[PDB]
Amino acid sequence: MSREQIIKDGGNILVTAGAGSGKTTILVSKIEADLKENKTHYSIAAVTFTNKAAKEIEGRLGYSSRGNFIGTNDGFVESEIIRPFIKDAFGNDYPDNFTAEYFDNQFASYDKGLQVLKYQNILGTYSNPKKNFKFQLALDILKKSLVARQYIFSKYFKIFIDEYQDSDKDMHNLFMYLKDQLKIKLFIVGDPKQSIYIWRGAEPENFNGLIENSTDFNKYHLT
Amino acid sequence: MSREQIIKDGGNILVTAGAGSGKTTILVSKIEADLKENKTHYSIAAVTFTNKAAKEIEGRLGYSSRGNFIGTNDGFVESEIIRPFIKDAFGNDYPDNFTAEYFDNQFASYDKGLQVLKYQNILGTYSNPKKNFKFQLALDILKKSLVARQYIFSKYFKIFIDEYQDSDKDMHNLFMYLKDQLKIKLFIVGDPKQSIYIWRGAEPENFNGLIENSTDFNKYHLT
Amino acid sequence: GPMKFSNITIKNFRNFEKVNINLDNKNVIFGMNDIGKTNFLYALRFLLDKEIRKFGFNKSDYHKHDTSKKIEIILTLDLSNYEKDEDTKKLISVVKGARTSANADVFYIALESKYDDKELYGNIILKWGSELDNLIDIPGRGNINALDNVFKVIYINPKMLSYSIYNYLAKKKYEDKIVIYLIEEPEISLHRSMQIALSKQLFEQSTYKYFFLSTHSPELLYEMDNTRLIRVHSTEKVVCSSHMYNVEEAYGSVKKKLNKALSSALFAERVLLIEGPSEKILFEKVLDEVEPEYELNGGFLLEVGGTYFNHYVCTLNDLGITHIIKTDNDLKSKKGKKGVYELLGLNRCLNLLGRENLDEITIDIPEDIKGKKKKERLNERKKEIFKQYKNEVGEFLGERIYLSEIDLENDLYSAIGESMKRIFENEDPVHYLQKSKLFNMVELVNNLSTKDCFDVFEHEKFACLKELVGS
């Protein structure tokens, strides 16, 4: 019975779920179980691109005194990692409050993007649709700031990751940095057949390599 | 005795003070007297470019439950008129939180400045050193928003204005709009001999015209 | 119009499941469920007073102790006359932003609270502004909220000295803030005349404005004028009904007796309207001889005299109080007589259901005909007009309005015929009773038997008493 396997969990869990949602109910069950068995100040982070998915996750879950974050990956980063520590990591000159618009710069060189971000306050994306600069900035702010690393270590003990096939190398590197260099548990679920956002920038080959090459993430089959 | 004339005040007061400060003590006395005789919710606004002047004004004054604003003209506007009502006047698309940098755009056409402000979030000044776009924006947001006009009318019953010879036509128009179209008392002090910031953008000829042509502002001579 | 409260949407409070009861500055709360009124006053204290917010919510503060639900009390304010209303300026000066230019008149002040199980302390999360859809972050600089500079609750709960000196203290010290007097039962240690004095200072003088008055004695409501009367229903599930109680200049002269009579009826579950005190004596005797607990299970004998029922009907219907009226068809002359008669007995019942006033009907009464013959002709005409308008009478019965065949005394004679003859020993006891209504009615009541009282009660022409008694 797969319910016993779901309940017994244990460390990192990878589930090969099917299409037609399905991942939502196991995500909710895992979140509720982790909140119930926990008895410390450690929080949880569940991230999903779909806004209405975040709305329903918040609606079906009750009020938690300890801060549990529900939102999108870019919103998650720009909310807790970029916004507070941008002044601490890169000096008081860098702005703290800003809005993200992808269709402003459309640059070709990383140095030009760095200059326009530093001076004109404008934050956009590469001309190449692949990769997201926000997660590279998150890596940069994490690398040279011990405060950000300490906050991420202490706040979340297990970060829940959804629709990981949509992830590119940047947030993949961010999540691996949190898992390895910060020893933070990761709960990742992904559908191998959901490779439809490739044009949007998704490159799931790293996820498939982790499925095959990596050994820490045990593979589970759900009916 | 000029002390009796200072105490008796009455409506708008214009004082031809001398150099070597001097205006600071009469400003503090007028502020304290207005706060003492007042018995309602009406607040007061004293504005000065000099930051250390604001610091000493705050230091020598006690804590007031009712909000009394001490700051610079651009800071005053960008704090209470632009920041809250920018979304209400011009829709939710306009940003609410931003930083002012004068040396970013350096444009020549008003339409180009409007486009760059709307799209790229950048806020600067004209290539012409005269005039300030911030006060024109304040006029624009006041004209088409009844909420902002109501707030300005209800909050401050008398707005104190300092070093008015540094004022150009834009904040002159803003202050006259508050005085006439909002029936708000104004306490303005200025030195005719302090016309040294002309290159910075100051054009006191309007102030001298109000001294001569206008009749509502009574002229007072201080020893 | 000046700034006025509009509505409070109390949800999932101590007893209020989901209620949206209108408000207007001068508010009066009364009726059953004293705990309901206390919970309403404490809800206002939570929404406006900082001295109650700091304690937060508890397990008992929620509806049925169910911590899953969320407390959401939303006060609605109406803003107008900006240049002359000082309190509008007071409210809109503190609020910076969060006011959409589309609707500068409406202003919401909500209070969201969710219970956490890891600390057992429901945090009070104020979220006020101008639109329910979009709320900007509240300043909240420490313990004092931005609202604390606008609305300060002056809680009065027992001593006329305190009431007298709160005027002076608020005038000399609380001019800057908006005073909201949450008076809870000021009749604890006040005499009847003291209650009248407090009502006069409350409902007439401008020193008590935006006040929420809780009362259990009718004496405190003798001066009601342009206030909002709120009545809590008798059911354990709290239901509150609101009504604008304003007297027109037509009723201004009789305002004193109007309020004196209506204030007592406001506290009755069922109210029966009558014209003359003889009707009061008869109905009181009948009820005492059939159901002395009519005042107990909910009942009243509202003596209205002249005037019209329109104000009474509106007030009793808006509060949801059971509406019962028994009236007499009277034809009164006006200006030149002998062919000019109004239909007040029927014109009233028409006005209660709206429609239009009937024209002044003409009755051909010869001058030589007078006394008994004139009264007989008038009774015949009244019977004819009653039989003519069968549909209107049917609607009145359908809307709990009872109109006599000709007059009340004729219906009483129809209900009991032999008893009247035995008591008065006259060939025409009805005429003798109309000769002097008061004394003859007293004499009839003194000699009225229990069997006669039962016969009067069970007769269909006196169904008003049956409806008042109820099941």
Side-chain angles (χ1 to χ4, degrees), chain A residues 83 93 95-99 101 103-104 118-122, chain B residues 83 93 95-99 101 103-104 118-122:
Chain A
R83 212 96 56 91
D93 44 5
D96 49 347
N97 45 357
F98 63 91
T99 61
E101 275 203 30
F103 63 93
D104 299 359
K118 190 188 153 319
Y119 295 128
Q120 286 80 13
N121 182 93
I122 57 171
Chain B
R83 212 96 56 91
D93 44 5
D96 49 347
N97 45 356
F98 63 91
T99 61
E101 275 203 30
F103 63 93
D104 299 359
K118 190 188 153 319
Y119 295 128
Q120 286 80 13
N121 182 92
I122 57 171

Side-chain angles (χ1 to χ4, degrees), chain B residues 68-79:
Chain B
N68 296 324
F69 188 87
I70 301 299
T72 61
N73 298 359
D74 47 355
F76 161 94
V77 172
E78 192 271 338
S79 66

Side-chain angles (χ1 to χ4, degrees), chain B residues 98-102 104-105 117 121-125 133-134 137:
Chain B
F98 63 91
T99 61
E101 275 203 30
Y102 317 135
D104 299 359
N105 49 3
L117 176 53
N121 182 92
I122 57 171
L123 183 66
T125 61
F133 167 60
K134 288 181 185 182
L137 189 58

Side-chain angles (χ1 to χ4, degrees), chain C residues 8-11 16-21 237-240:
Chain C
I8 181 168
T9 310
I10 299 181
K11 293 169 52 60
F16 307 100
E17 186 183 1
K18 182 175 73 175
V19 290
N20 59 5
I21 62 170
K237 185 282 201 183
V238 56
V239 178
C240 311

